[PDB]
Design a binder for this molecule. Structure first.
Ligand SMILES: [Cu+2]
Length: 128
């Protein structure tokens, strides 16, 4: 069935959606990230990272501190429920995670951790 979604990050520092719905009948969910545009990873790299709303800021801040060589994400970050690699234009990456990780009474957010991008590149991921 449909327990997957295609997300795009472009040269204008924007995702093509700020809301993803995960049907409760899904046991696992897949996000397929692509990067239309022409800019390379260093100027406009994008990733897809999922965490609780409360942990978002910490994940973003520590991600920047980790550096481009670590795809701007702190290694073994226990706050990260799902993540794709950092990609440049023309590249792609997919990630699958267990829906059981979406704890009851928690609001999940998806965002890009490349320095400054989360200002525009964010969205809600809700289970229903
Ligand atoms: Cu980005």
């Amino acid at each position: 069935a449909q327990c997957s979604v295609d997300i795009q990050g472009n040269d204008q520092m924007q995702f093509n959606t700020n809301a993803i719905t995960v049907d409760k009948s899904c046991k696992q969910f897949t996000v397929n990230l692509s990067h239309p545009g022409n800019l390379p990873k260093n100027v406009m790299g994008h990733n897809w990272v999922l965490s609780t709303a409360a942990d978002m800021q910490g994940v973003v801040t520590d991600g920047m501190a980790s550096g481009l060589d670590k795809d701007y994400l702190k290694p073994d970050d226990s706050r990260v429920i799902a993540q794709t690699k950092l990609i440049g234009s023309g590249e792609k990456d997919s990630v699958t995670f267990d829906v059981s990780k979406l704890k009851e009474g928690e609001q999940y957010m998806f965002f890009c951790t490349f320095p400054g991008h989360s200002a525009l590149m964010w969205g809600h991921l809700t289970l229903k």
